[PDB]
Amino acid sequence: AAPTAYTPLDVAQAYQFPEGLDGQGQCIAIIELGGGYDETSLAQYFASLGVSAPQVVSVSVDGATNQPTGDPNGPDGEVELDIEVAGALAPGAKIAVYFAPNTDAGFLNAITTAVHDPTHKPSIVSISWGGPEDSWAPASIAAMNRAFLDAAALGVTVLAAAGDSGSTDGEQDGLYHVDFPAASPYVLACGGTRLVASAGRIERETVWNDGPDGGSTGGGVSRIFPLPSWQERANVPPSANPGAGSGRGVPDVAGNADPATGYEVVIDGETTVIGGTSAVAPLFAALVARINQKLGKPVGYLNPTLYQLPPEVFHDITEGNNDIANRARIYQAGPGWDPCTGLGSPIGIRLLQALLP
Ligand SMILES: [Ca+2]
């Protein structure tokens, strides 16, 4: 009903992030195709939450640099949300922000640069930018997909927001579309939910869907990537598009994204609320950072493992749909994996326990 908001620490608590871990010794890389961040907002923010501020550094890719536009409603919102959510939850981690031109090659080069960076050596890459997989040049999808495969082989986890325009992903050709890079099978695709939670329990968690005007989580079935072997037990449905082909199901996991139960953040000096799947990648990047710290070695590519874990590791979202285009309710949430929320929201301490040697 009435819109609410949480600080990142409140959501981490709801998802039971493992205590006593802050990401020390880990570096989280965050990809950005526009805007920038200002030290004032970040300082004010971390101080407001009582956490020691992580070191944040910028990396220039193809001439692009950290350049805030000063508009709290522009890309500075994406850049600062990413750093504030990931940094508030893995404050001991080092954060490296890679700025690149907003072009197909810039996005690709930012990924390859971050993944192979011998200076910052990130173990995790968080991405909150994208586009309909069918709207990208095929050559770019192939190049970026190979870059994520390379990251997997190197032990670097790559997480990406699934989109904020529902099952149609903003296209109006009357067909359903999943977003890229989330569609890549080598990426931990992050969907979005409406979360009602307090420190001790989750009262309700449903698919984020605020209609055409408020946005909804991306999710569906890839028309490009075949169904992965490790995802064959998830009961991914065939595509809802005529032809009903089989394909990689999106997302893999999901977390709070509804702006109506959004994140309180400080953008360009303004205290406000932001949501979108954009917040989920940084949120779980912080979770992985804590897990890597405890394990003493990076988890790297997690998809295959996550899909073989027991039900206790996730909170199953079973209600809602991510259709903001028509009344067909494509696609719908349900028991088990679904094309709106994947395996659901992770229960941190249980995921960590499941990964302990
Ligand atoms: Ca479900």
Curated annotation (Swiss-Prot):
It is an enzyme of class 3 (hydrolase). Changing residue 164 to A: Loses both auto-processing activity and proteolytic activity. One of its GO terms (biological process) is proteolysis. One of its GO terms (cellular component) is extracellular region. The active site is at 78 (charge relay system), 82 (charge relay system), 278 (charge relay system). Inactivated at 22.4 and 37 degrees Celsius, but not at 60 degrees Celsius, by aldehyde-type inhibitors such as acetyl-Ile-Ala-Phe-CHO and acetyl-Ile-Pro-Phe-CHO. Insensitive to the known carboxyl proteinase inhibitors pepstatin, diazoacetyl-DL-norleucine methyl ester (DAN) and 1,2-epoxy-3-(p-nitrophenoxy)propane (EPNP). Not inhibited by Ala-Ala-Phe-chloromethylketone, an inhibitor of the human tripeptidyl-peptidase 1. The keyword Secreted applies. Its main location: secreted. This is Kumamolisin. It comes from Bacillus sp. (strain MN-32). The lineage of its organism: Bacteria, Bacillati, Bacillota, Bacilli, Bacillales.
